[PDB]
Ligand binder design. Structure first.
Ligand SMILES: O=C(O)[C@@](O)(COP(=O)(O)O)[C@H](O)[C@H](O)COP(=O)(O)O
Ligand SMILES: O=C(O)[C@@](O)(COP(=O)(O)O)[C@H](O)[C@H](O)COP(=O)(O)O
Ligand SMILES: O=C(O)[C@@](O)(COP(=O)(O)O)[C@H](O)[C@H](O)COP(=O)(O)O
Ligand SMILES: O=C(O)[C@@](O)(COP(=O)(O)O)[C@H](O)[C@H](O)COP(=O)(O)O
Ligand SMILES: [Mg+2]
Ligand SMILES: [Mg+2]
Ligand SMILES: [Mg+2]
Ligand SMILES: [Mg+2]
Lengths: 450, 99, 452, 452, 450
C-alpha cells in the first residue's frame, strides 16, 4: 500500500457532495494557521473528527472510507460546512456527538481558532433521543397555569444561608406570587447548608405557600453533585418529599450524568430544570468554541424541561436576534434557517417535546416589557436580586414582579405596543400596587448596555 | 397549648418583655417579631412582622413595633425573636402576646 | 436595610485580605469592558462566583458574609487573585468547584474576556478526594515494567473498522512491541462496530500477544457512553473479560459520570485511561477560557491513572514550558509556582497518587529523543498513525517505536546527550533494526512547528 | 544491612522536629518502667504506634521512614508530645486512629502506665469526616426551640418495665414539659420489653403529648444491638414510625458500627443521640487510659448530634474545668489550648457542625442554677430519677424541672446573678408552681461533692 | 408511694442470695470513695448496672424488682460478687452485656476505682451465641496441619510499605516456612498502601509460596475499616481472591461490627483472626478496668478463630499463671475455678468451638522453649521483627523460626524437659540449620523482664 503523509483535502474535501437528509451537518467558522488554506483546514477538521489521521494507514484498506468519512462539501468565506454520515454516531448519545465533533479538532496547530456555529441534527438521529421528560404543554397542565410567563427567582445570597433561613426566603417569595424559586447553581451540599436539611425545610415552605395562595408551587431543588449516584439519591429524596421539580447543572455535571438524571426524573415524575453553568467559558467569543444554539439543541435532545437562554437586557451577555432563534429552536416543531438570527440550517424536531426558555440575571420590573416582547408567554422570568432586593423584602418583591408581568400581558393582549408603552403600562399597574411602585423607584436608574 | 420558651412561667409583663429585648440587643443580636393565628407543632414559619430589625438601637423601638403588630393582628399569637447571624440561628424566641 | 445597587468592589475587593492556607485561590486573567475599572470587574467575578448578586438583598444580613464571601485580594497587571473560603465547596466534588468558579462569571457584560489560568487547591480540600485508583507506582508494579517510557497507540482508522479487523490490528501492534493500544476517543458503540463485539475480540488479541511475547499487555477499551449506567455496564464487561484497563473521555462524559466510573474501576480492579476530548474547546485561547493545567488538577483529584498532556512536537498545540508544568502537576508531590510556566501558585498534592502523562498525536520515531528529554521515563508515548502507517504495517511499526524508545533510554543512561546525539542514536539502532530504518526514511521530512 | 536491636530513641526521639500543620499530634502522660529513661519510653510509644518494632528489619530500607515515622518531638515533665504524619491515617476512619494511637503501646513492659490526654486533629484530616448529621443549629430549627437549655430524662427503672408501662411514663413526662425522654443505655431488646413493642407504644405517647402540649417532642429510641444489621433495622423502624430521634451507645457498639448508624440516620432524617456507656472504663484514672476529651473529639468527627459530658454536680465524676473544655470542644469552631483544662493543643474544627452537650445523672431542681451557669443554653439537662421520683409522679416532676430551667434563664437574661441568687430564684418560681416546691422540699438535702 | 433517696444496699445487697445456674455472675474489685463501705459501693454497682437509680421512682411499683434486680450476694475483702438474672440481657449481644455490666458503674463518684476481674457466663446465655465460625479442630482440618504450634509473623515496617513490596516480604516469609503472615493492626487502607492493591499482590505471594513449598498458606488480610459496610466489602474481596483468612481489630472496630464480620466470614468460608488492639488501655492496671480473661470470653462467644493472648516473655506485659488460665478459657470445654490463675468462677463452654491463642510481640528463637511449654501445640507463634530482622532477611528468618519450633516439639514428645534443656535443644537443631545459628547469635543477649 501507499504509505506516507497525504493532504487531508484529498479525501475529506468534496465540494460536489450533496448532503443527505440523514447526514449530520456542521457549520464551523475556521481561523487557519497563517498559510493554511480554508480547504485543508476544513478537511483536517472533517478527517480528524471522523475516520482519518496524520499519515496513511494500511488498515484504511480493510474498510470503505467513502461510506464513513466526514466531508466538507461547501466553504463560504471563513465558514465550512461538513457532512457526517449517520452510521458514525452512537444512538442516543450526546457524549458521542461531542467526542467526534468537538473532540480533538479545536486543538490542532493547523487551525488556530475554531467555532461550531450550528448543527443540523437529522430527524433519523433525533428519533434515538427521548427529549424532555415533561415538556411545555404537559408542564403547564401539571401546574394548571396558562396565558402568561411563569415567575421564578434564585434564592440569595448564593451561598452562606442555613437551611431554615433558606426556606424562609422561599416561603416569602412563593406566598407573594412567584410560581417557583430555585437553588443557586453552585448551591449543592456544603458545611453551611447540607442538601437533606434544605430539601426538607424548603418543601415545608412550598406546601405552606401553596395552601395559602391556592396556586400550585415548586422549588427547583439542585441535585447537582460529585457523582451520578449522589445526584440520583438527591432526586429520589426530592420525589419522596413530593417536589414537582429538581434542578441540574447539565454542563458542570456533564451530559452522561445528565442523561442518567433525566431518565430517573421521568420515572419519578419529576420535572427537570436545567442550568447552563459553564456555558460562557466556550460559547461567548465569536472566534472559538461552541455557540449556545448548538448546546440548546443538545439540551432538548437529552431532555430538559427548561433551560436558561439569557435575558439580552440583563447583567449577562446575549444578542436579541440570536436569542429569538434559540427560543424557536427550543419550543417549535420546525425552525427554518434564518441568516439574520444565525440559524445556518433548517431544523426539524421530529415530534420531540418543547423546552421552556428561562430568562434570568440582573433583571427587575422595568425589563418586563422587553422580556414579554422577546419571549412571549412560554418562558420563565427569574428575579433573584430583583425580588429579595425589594425595599420591603422578598414577599413584596415577588408581588411586584408578578403584577408587572400580568399587567404587561394584559396590555399586549388588548393590542397595545408594550415596548412603546412599557413605562406607561407599569405606571398604570403601579397605581394599584404599592410594591410595584417601590420597585420601580428603587431600580429606575439601573440599566445594562445592549 | 404551650408556646416553648417561658410558656411555663406566668405571662410576661411589658417590662419583662422589654428586659428580654434588652438582653437580645446587649449581646449584639437582632430582635424580631412574628405572629400567627395557627400556632402548633405543625407551624415552623410564623408570619413576619416587617423584616428582622437589623437597624434597631433601643428596646423601645422594638416595643413600639410589638404594639403596632398587636393592633393589626389582635387575634394572633405574637412572639419576640432574637437572632444571631454568626451562629446563623435564633438565640431566643418567646410569645409576648396571646389572643 | 439599605436596598439598592452598590458597586461590587465595595464588598468583594479587599486588597488587605491575607489568604488562609485553607482558602481556594484563583488567578483570573481579566479583560474588563471598556470603561469598567479593573477593580470593579474583578469584584464582579469574586461576587458572582461566591455569595453576591447585582443588588443588595435583605437576606445577606441573615448570615456572616465576612466568613463566606470570596475576595479579590490582589490585582497584578491583568491578573486578579481571588480567595474562596473552604466552607464554600462541597467535599469531593469537582462538579461543585466548576459550578462556582466557572459557572456564570465568564458571561458578564462587565467582563469582555476572562481566562482562569490557575487554581491553588488547599490541602484540606484535596484530602476529600480519592485521587487515581492505581497511580504510576502501582501501575508499573501491575505491568512489571520499569525503566523506560511505555508504548501505546490509537487504532486507526478512527471509525469504520469492524470488531474483528479492529482486534487484528491490536494483535499486530501488541505482538510487535507496544505495551498497549487504545480505542479512539470517538469510538464507543456504533453500527459498524458494537462495543461487546469489540471488547470480546480485542481481549483475545491481548491475551494472544501477551502469551507470545511474554510481556504483559493491555488495551484501553473505551467505555464512554451516553449515560452513566451504560458506561458502568461496559466497565463491568471489560473486567469480566480480564482487561487490565478501561478508557473514558472524562470531559465529554463529564465529571459527575467520570467520578462514578473511577469508583467502579477501583472496585473492579481496572486501571483508568482518561482521554481529554473537548479540552481545547475550553483551553485553546489565551484571552478567554480555562487553561488545561486547571483541568489536569481536577483530573488528578477525581482519579485518573493517565491523562493526555500534549506532545509539544506533534500535530496538536502544546507549549514546552506549559507542558513541563502540567507534567509536574500530575506526577510530583509538591510543585512550586512559576508564572513562566503558567503556574501562579504552589501546589501541595497531600499524598495523592501520581498520574501518567500521555504524549500522543502526530508523533513518530524522529520525535523520540525530544519526547524522552521532555518527559523522562514516567509517561506513555502513543503512535497511532506512526505505527499503522509503517510501510510494512502495524507489527513492523510497533517494533520500530519500541526499539527507538529503548535505544534512546539506553544512551541517556550511559551519559550520552540524547538531544545533541538524537539523530546518531536513532541511526545506530537502525543498523540492528530494519523496521526502524524504514520508519525513519518514511517520515524524515514530516515536521510540525514548535513553541518554547 | 545492620541487623540487631537498637534503642527506640535513636530513630523515634527527635526533639529538633517541628510539627507540621498536617501532622496529628498526641500528648501522652508517660510513667516509664523504673530504669527506662523517659526519652526511651517515649520513643517506644512513638515507634510502636507508627512504623517501628523491637529490632531492625531489612525492609525498613524499602521505604522512606523519615517521611512516615512518628516522632517524639518534645518531653515536658511526664508528658511526651508525638507527631504523626498525615499519610499514616485512613481517611474518615476513627477506627484507624485508635488502631495506631492506642492499639498496642499501652501494654509495653517498658512503660508502666500511659494516658492519652489530648490529640490535635489536623484540619486536613478533619475534612475527611462528615461530622454530626444534624448539629445544634439545624436541630433547634427542627424542634422550633430557642433560648433555653432543653429538657430530657431517662425512663426508670432502667430495666424491667413492659412496653406499655414504658410508654405511659414517657407520655406523662412529655405532656408535663420535658422536651424529650430516653431509653436507658442498657435497654435494647429483652424478654420483658422487646424493641418493636417499645418503639410502637412509645411513639403513640410522643404524638399524643405533642398534640396536647403544642410543643414538638421526641423520644431517644435506643437502637443499640448486637450487630450492625440489627441496629440499622431498628433505626429504619423508628423512621417508619416518624420518630425525630434514635439513640446509640457508640462505645459499646463501637466506632465502626457507630459510623454505619450515623450514615443511615442522615439518610433517614433521624437525629442521633449518643450515649457514652463504657467511657469510664477507659477514662477514669489519671495515670492510665484515654481522657474523655479525646473520645469527645472522635465523637464529633464521626457525627453525633448530642453526647453526654457529665454534670460536675451530679452522681458521676466530672471536673468543672475539664467539663468546660469538653463543652467547648463539642460546640465551638475553634478552641485554644489550656492545659489547666487538659487541653494541650489548640483545635480547629474546620467548619464541622457542633454537638449538644448532655448533662445527666443524679441531678435535680436545686442543681439547675449551677447547670445553666456551666453550660449556658446549648445543652440538654436530663432528669430521670429527678422526674419520676417527684412525690406526685412523672408529669409533676417534669413540670418542676421545665419551670426551674425557664425561671433561671429568665433571671439570667434580666441581669440577675443566678449563682448568688440561685436559691431565691427557685423559691420565687416555686411560689407559682407547687410541683417545683415539692421537688425542692424532697431533695433539698441531696448533694454530691464537687471538684473545680 | 415513698419518694426520696434510699440506700442502694437496701434493695441491691442480699448476702443470703444463692446464685442460679442461669445467673450471670461478676467478680468486681472495688475501691470505694473514702468512707463508702464495700456493701454500699457494691450495691451501687449492682443497682446502676441493672434496674435502679439514685432516688426512688413511682414506676418501680409497676414491675417486680425482685425478679429483675442484680444482687451483690457475697463480699470477700475488696472483691464483690454480683448476680444478674438471665432475663436482663439481650440474647446474642455482647454489646448489651457491656452496656449493663460496664456501662456507667466505672464513673460513679462513690466508687473511685473498679475492675471487672471475671464473669461466669451461664450456659443458658452462651447458647444464644454462635462462637467461632471455624474453631481449632476445623481450622487444623482446613490447613492439614497437626502436631505443632503454627508459625506466623507481622509484616514490618508497620506502615510505609507499598503493596508490591509488602507482598514481597510475605512471599519470602511464607516460602521460608511460616504458615501465615499478617497485616499490622493499624494497616488498613492508607495513601502509601491501599487495601485492594495489597489484597491482590499478597494473594499472588500466598499462592506462589503454597505451590513452591507444598504446604497450605494464608495471609491475615486486615479488613478493619471506618464502617461496617467497608469492612464487609473488604471481606468479600478477600474471599473473591480465595484467601483462607481475614483479620479484624475487634475492639477498635467494635463488637457490633465485629459480630457483622464474623457472620459474613462464616457465610464466605473465611477464617477470622482477631487482634486485641486497645485492650491494654483498660486491662493492664490491677485497680481499674476489665481483665483480659473477660475480654477473651466475650471474644469466644461472638466468634473469633484466633485471638492474641500475649507471650509473657516478650516485649508486652503478661503473667504466666493468668495466661495459662486464659488459654484454657479459649480452648477447653470446661474450665474450673483456680485462684492461682485468677479464675474466679467455673466456666462451662456449652459446646462452643475453641479458639487459637496467638503469642506475638518481641519474641525470637530463644523464646521457643518457653512458648511451647506455656501454650502447647494449639497456638500460633508470630515472629515479625524476629523474622525480617534476621541478618539474611525474611526467608532465612522464617526457616529459623520454623526449625526452632519443630525441634522443640520433637524434644518434648521424646520426653525431654524443654525448659531445662531449651538452649541445648536449639543448639542441636542449629548444627543442621545455619539460619537458626545466625538468629541465635544475633538475639542471644535480647531479654525482657518477667
Ligand atoms: O447566579 C445567578 O446570577 C442567577 O442566580 C441570577 O441571580 P439574580 O436573579 O440575582 O441576577 C442565575 O444563575 C443567572 O441568571 C444564570 O445566568 P444565565 O441565566 O445567563 O445562565
Ligand atoms: O485521535 C487522535 O488524533 C489520537 O488518537 C492520535 O492519533 P495519531 O496517533 O494517529 O496521531 C489521539 O486521540 C490524540 O493524540 C489526542 O490528542 P491529545 O493527546 O492532545 O489529547
Ligand atoms: O443510667 C443512668 O444513670 C442515666 O440514665 C441517669 O439516670 P438518672 O437521671 O436517674 O440519674 C444516664 O445514663 C447517666 O447519667 C449516664 O451517665 P453520663 O451522663 O455521665 O454518661
Ligand atoms: O504491632 C506489633 O507489635 C505486632 O505486630 C508484633 O510485632 P513483632 O512481631 O515485630 O514484635 C503485634 O501486633 C503485637 O504483638 C500485638 O501485641 P499482643 O499480641 O500482645 O496483642
Ligand atoms: Mg445562580
Ligand atoms: Mg483519538
Ligand atoms: Mg442510663
Ligand atoms: Mg501489630
Amino acid at each position: 500500500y501507499e504509505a506516507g503523509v497525504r493532504p487531508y483535502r484529498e479525501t475529506y474535501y468534496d465540494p460536489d457532495y450533496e448532503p443527505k437528509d440523514t447526514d449530520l451537518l456542521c457549520a464551523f467558522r475556521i481561523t487557519p494557521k497563517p498559510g493554511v488554506p480554508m480547504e485543508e483546514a476544513a478537511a483536517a477538521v472533517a478527517a480528524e473528527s471522523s475516520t482519518g489521521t496524520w499519515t496513511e494507514v494500511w488498515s484504511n484498506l480493510l474498510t470503505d472510507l467513502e461510506r464513513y468519512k466526514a466531508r466538507c462539501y461547501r466553504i463560504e468565506g471563513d465558514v465550512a460546512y461538513i457532512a457526517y454520515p449517520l452510521d458514525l454516531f452512537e444512538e442516543g448519545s450526546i457524549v458521542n456527538i461531542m467526542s467526534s465533533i468537538v473532540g480533538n479538532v479545536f486543538g490542532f496547530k493547523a487551525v488556530q481558532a475554531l467555532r461550531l456555529e450550528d448543527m443540523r441534527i437529522p430527524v433519523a438521529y433525533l428519533k434515538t433521543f427521548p427529549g424532555p421528560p415533561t415538556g411545555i404543554q404537559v408542564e403547564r397542565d401539571r401546574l394548571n397555569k396558562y396565558g402568561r410567563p411563569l415567575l421564578g427567582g434564585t434564592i440569595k445570597p448564593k451561598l452562606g444561608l442555613s437551611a431554615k433561613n433558606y426556606a424562609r426566603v422561599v416561603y416569602e417569595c412563593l406566598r407573594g406570587g412567584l410560581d417557583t424559586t430555585k437553588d443557586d447553581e453552585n448551591l449543592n451540599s456544603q458545611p453551611f447548608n447540607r442538601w437533606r436539611d434544605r430539601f426538607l425545610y424548603v418543601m415545608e415552605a412550598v406546601r405552606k405557600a401553596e395552601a395559602e395562595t391556592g396556586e400550585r408551587k415548586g422549588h427547583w431543588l439542585n441535585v447537582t453533585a460529585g457523582s451520578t449516584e449522589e445526584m440520583l439519591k438527591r432526586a429520589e429524596f426530592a420525589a419522596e418529599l413530593g417536589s414537582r421539580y429538581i434542578m441540574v447543572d447539565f454542563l458542570t455535571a456533564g451530559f452522561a450524568a445528565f442523561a442518567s438524571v433525566r431518565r430517573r426524573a421521568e420515572e419519578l415524575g419529576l420535572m427537570l430544570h436545567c442550568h447552563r453553568a459553564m456555558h460562557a467559558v466556550f460559547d461567548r467569543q465569536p472566534n472559538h468554541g461552541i455557540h449556545f444554539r448548538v448546546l440548546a439543541k443538545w439540551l432538548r435532545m437529552v431532555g430538559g424541561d427548561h433551560v436558561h437562554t439569557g435575558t439580552v437586557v440583563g447583567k449577562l451577555e446575549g444578542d436579541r436576534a440570536e436569542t429569538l432563534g434559540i427560543a424557536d429552536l427550543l419550543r417549535e416543531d420546525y425552525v427554518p434557517a434564518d441568516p439574520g438570527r444565525g440559524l445556518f440550517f433548517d431544523q426539524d424536531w421530529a415530534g420531540l417535546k418543547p423546552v421552556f426558555p428561562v430568562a434570568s440575571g440582573g433583571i427587575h420590573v422595568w425589563h418586563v416589557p422587553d422580556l414579554v416582547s422577546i419571549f412571549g408567554d412560554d418562558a420563565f422570568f427569574l428575579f433573584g436580586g430583583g425580588t429579595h432586593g425589594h425595599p420591603r423584602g422578598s414577599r413584596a418583591g415577588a408581588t411586584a414582579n408578578r403584577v408587572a408581568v400580568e399587567a404587561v400581558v394584559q396590555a399586549r393582549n388588548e393590542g397595545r405596543d408594550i415596548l412603546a408603552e412599557g413605562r406607561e403600562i407599569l405606571e398604570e399597574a403601579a397605581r394599584s400596587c404599592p410594591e410595584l411602585r417601590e420597585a420601580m423607584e428603587l431600580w429606575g436608574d439601573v440599566k445594562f448596555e445592549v | 397549648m404551650h408556646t416553648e420558651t417561658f410558656s411555663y412561667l406566668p405571662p410576661l409583663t411589658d417590662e419583662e418583655i422589654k428586659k428580654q429585648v434588652e438582653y437580645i440587643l446587649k449581646n449584639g443580636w437582632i430582635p424580631g417579631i412574628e405572629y400567627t393565628d395557627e400556632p402548633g407543632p405543625h407551624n415552623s414559619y410564623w408570619s413576619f412582622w416587617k423584616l428582622p430589625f437589623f437597624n434597631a438601637e433601643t428596646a423601645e423601638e422594638v416595643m413600639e413595633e410589638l404594639e403596632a403588630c398587636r393592633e393589626a393582628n389582635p387575634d394572633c399569637y405574637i412572639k419576640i425573636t432574637g437572632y444571631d447571624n454568626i451562629r446563623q440561628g435564633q438565640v431566643l424566641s418567646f410569645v409576648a402576646y396571646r389572643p
